Amino acid sequence: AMDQVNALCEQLVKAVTVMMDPNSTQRYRLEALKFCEEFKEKCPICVPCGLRLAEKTQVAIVRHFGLQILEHVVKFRWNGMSRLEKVYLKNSVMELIANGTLNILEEENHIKDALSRIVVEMIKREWPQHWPDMLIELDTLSKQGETQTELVMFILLRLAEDVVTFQTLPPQRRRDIQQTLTQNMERIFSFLLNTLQENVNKYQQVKTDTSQESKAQANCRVGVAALNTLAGYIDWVSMSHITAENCKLLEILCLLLNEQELQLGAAECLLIAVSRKGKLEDRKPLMVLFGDVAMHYILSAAQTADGGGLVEKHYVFLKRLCQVLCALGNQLCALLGADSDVETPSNFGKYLESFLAFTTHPSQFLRSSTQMTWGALFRHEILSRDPLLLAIIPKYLRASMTNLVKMGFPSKTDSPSCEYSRFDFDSDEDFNAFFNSSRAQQGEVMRLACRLDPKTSFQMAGEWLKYQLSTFSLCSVFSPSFVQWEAMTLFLESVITQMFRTLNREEIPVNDGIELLQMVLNFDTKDPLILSCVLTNVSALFPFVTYRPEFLPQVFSKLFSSVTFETVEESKAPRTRAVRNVRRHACSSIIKMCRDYPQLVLPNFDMLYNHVKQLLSNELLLTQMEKCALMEALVLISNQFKNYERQKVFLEELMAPVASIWLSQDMHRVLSDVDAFIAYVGTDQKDPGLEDPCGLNRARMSFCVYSILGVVKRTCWPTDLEEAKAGGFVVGYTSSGNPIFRNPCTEQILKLLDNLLALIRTHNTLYAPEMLAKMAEPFTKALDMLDAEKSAILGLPQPLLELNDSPVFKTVLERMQRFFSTLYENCFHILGKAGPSMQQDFYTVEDLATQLLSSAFVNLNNIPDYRLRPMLRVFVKPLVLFCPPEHYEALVSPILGPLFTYLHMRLSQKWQVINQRESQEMLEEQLVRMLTREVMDLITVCCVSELTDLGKCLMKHEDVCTALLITAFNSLAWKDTLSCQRTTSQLCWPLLKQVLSGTLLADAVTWLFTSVLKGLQMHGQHDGCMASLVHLAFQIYEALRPRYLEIRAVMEQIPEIQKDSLDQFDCKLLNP
Amino acid sequence: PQVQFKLVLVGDGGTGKTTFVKRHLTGEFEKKYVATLGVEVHPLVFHTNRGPIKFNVWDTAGQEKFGGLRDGYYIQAQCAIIMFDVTSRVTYKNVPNWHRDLVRVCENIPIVLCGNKVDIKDRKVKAKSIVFHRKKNLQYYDISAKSNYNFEKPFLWLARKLIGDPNLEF
RNA sequence: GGCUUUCAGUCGGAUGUUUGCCGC
RNA sequence: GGUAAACAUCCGACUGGAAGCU
């Protein structure tokens, strides 16, 4: 009625050819496609056609399409088939394996696939119960030869994948084949093992025996299949089978690591095996790999990592072997720590020797990889005490020194590593990113190494220093010297800080210490980048001066000279970055020095005082930033007077010029009036590029702000009570009996507070569009974000400008832009720090809260996101958190109330803009995310500890309370998935848990639950939110539905709810 | 014209395989998702520092009911790109499928994995959750056919791999 | 239902390390 | 020195994958 077998085969050949034709009419294509679909659905003689096309004579393309048919029939048409038809199709396909395919070495990989897919498809249709002799049938086919055995391996691996890993079958049918698999798993895995074992053997003697290449090549190909298909089971199957015959499977897999043709397969089996997670006791037998026998083949294969140039085949094996060795160490670390029967392997020395082989190899990738396992080895409760590990650290750190040197670019040719870096990373950018992030992790691991062998680490950091000191825009840049110096510094500094934690007060190489300290001191450079390492090496070595205070002056000399300039050139050329970097770096070391050893710097105080006084004498000489770092340092030494009045007098004298300029009559006007202010700073004016007087003004104002902040941040009573008493710092003691301190800088700072709040208020007012429009067109984005700060928070990276260059010149607009951002943050910083510094002399200030509200919180409606975030973090968070409860009433309450109300309102409106939906807008979306997190965090830290005192306390307030609940439950509706869980689990609940008994205004109850639901509505998709929100929804319907009845009102508006199933649950809780 | 290589493009329906290619060839962005039927082979020429290099790109339809020969298009391929969408979590789940199918039919070919449409508001598939490429030792590049972010990176890497010249420039 | 260890996710907290930026 | 962002080690908050227990 339809067609004859002969006729269809003909068109099917014409259709497969047109489809494979790269250059065929698109129209002929569709008709070919439409032919085949129809054929595969309706044609009753498909199997005769499939078997015909599928036959060895045709072109591979055609054979494959024949086989694809026989697969499509098993897969879509089995149910519309007679028992006889099936038995016929089965026997034909089984015949196909028997001898309907080409022999082994001829025969495309794809045909083996297509034939294989058909068997697997029939196995999944009916393996356990209608096809019981399948395992025997395959076992029979496999004895016929290698072409067959390979085919069986293709099938057992596809079958293992589809049912277990991809599990692509209905749940029910899937489950039964897996149970069957497991039941037969000893048989199946025994079969995989012996196949492998014999095939390898035959390949063994026959390999190098000239007149037998075809059989060596064949027995090999089966090995590869076995290893491949084994790799399908090795991770999922019970550990019984792996361990099976005195662990023969794992033994051979090690032996095969030294056979070039089977290694990658065997490495891949080892890898999966040893990454097997789960029950700790199931991994215990993995320790066999540490055995004498296995370790031998492991080490042998690892020794061949001679690294003699990049051979793609070998290097790819090494990347694999390496991961095997990594996982096997993490296994060891995980099994030992748990004391559970696992005792340190005898052969541990061999594992290490072998691991070290990869640690010292040229390849960046290979070295980086070892790090994590080394980090696990070095923090082991037990293995860091192992002496085989102790023994290995000299060789390890020796490796790390080289690892520290930033050599091996994909583009350059300087070192062996360069070759491989090309294999592994597209560009230098991909290389950098890997390198730098690698070295972060490398950092922590190297410390643990030093912590375990402090003597050696110091000795080798020592010798690398002595070495660097005497070796090697045409002065210095990114030359081999600088790169060598930076790595050397970094190692040493790392080594010394570590040493002064582990070695007792007495094991210190003092003599060798000062030895090096001297050499560093006497060394000399006119080159900024080198000096900058010098300065670091001084600070690293500086704990030595504790023993030999004679050296202090030299130390001061070294640092202060660097502060002043870099004699690249003075008032004639522009300041290069590396120059302004060392100066900053020196000033930094000055603070670190004074902050860390101050009894030490103490005897030398007048001299430093005098020095800094001299340096500031010419107001034009140092940077404001430099000026203040020095003042900061001076403050830090005065902490050591440990005496109130003594410090009181110093600081008032230190601050005496700053007070002058700040409390000045015309400064007051500048600080209070917006027009006075715009004036002082030069946004009023259009020489369209001679800002000149404007700059100096806005630098003096920065100077005061920088100072006030400096003093507040650093001033300190003695940290020892008994001592704090004696210098007259203790004012009395708390109810709980904790001393109450007064701080020497209180009187002085408090005097500057009115002008600060003055400036703060004014600065905030400038953000009004009618104030902002008062700026001149040159400077209209004076108060916008620096393009620096933009690509910053969009993740859009930057190029690295050379430190020997000043190409980016400080634009008049960019100059102001930097000023505003810093002045804004710095003012708030002082207020942030005022609380924890002054204590209850700041908190008890009269009408503080009102002053703060009218200044700091004055113009929020116009204050942007990027300003408010800084404000909250730097100012509000600390103001509140450091407040003694006595005044949660006085000021915390009157401030947080209006703040939370506002913030919440601001955010909801911000979120509705976002819910409404190039770079310029997309950017602002990011700032809403970060602000929201900041706000939620602020709320959490405030009352979550269940609530803190000021949690309880703020709740016992009308406005505060409402604002905390609204905000918290509204958070669930914002599209930021990070806040959902945080707020839900930590915040939403204990808030309601506080306002159970009493007034739960009916309208409030209904809203609360609707808002939790909007949460489930917004998120949904995300497993984190949903679970967490469901539970929270459940807690509200359970503490609130025994009392109120309007909760159910809400439930019934939810799409698809059986009211009957509701009723049943509703009454279940209203009875017992 | 010179060497010429066979390139196989696989992945779920709607991950933008056809649009990625239509771009490279013409240089225009296609908006409507007209479902691909089977395959559409496209030649792409790349004047390198080593001469012109051609790419026969087999744009195979990854819609269940529309792939023609499917596995048959992989026949004698020499490099492949497996593509998925970051809007659809499902498409990254299905990557190991597209992979098993490829290596089985033609083993040892360089494959590049590609997460498309990174220009879309919020990525459901987070850049940190992408680990498959590391377990199967393949290259990855998140990309966009509307944005052109890493537009040529997959071709360049393949080209680099086939010719065995790490310094190869497009 | 009452009490716990192991294994992946989504966070949370605490240290630690690294990389950017800081002439106003 | 300060500030922001990445990663790593450790001890909870819940979703889900094996069991011990009153």
Ligand SMILES: Nc1nc2c(ncn2[C@@H]2O[C@H](COP(=O)(O)OP(=O)(O)OP(=O)(O)O)[C@@H](O)[C@H]2O)c(=O)[nH]1
């Ligand atoms: N925003 C965005 N949309 C894209 C991008 N790439 C593709 N699309 C859209 O995705 C949809 C489908 O793209 P196609 O290329 O047709 O999908 P395909 O891989 O050919 O689908 P199949 O061939 O059937 O597997 C279209 O609606 C395109 O507009 C992208 O990079 N960004």
Ligand SMILES: [Mg+2]
């Ligand atoms: Mg397509």
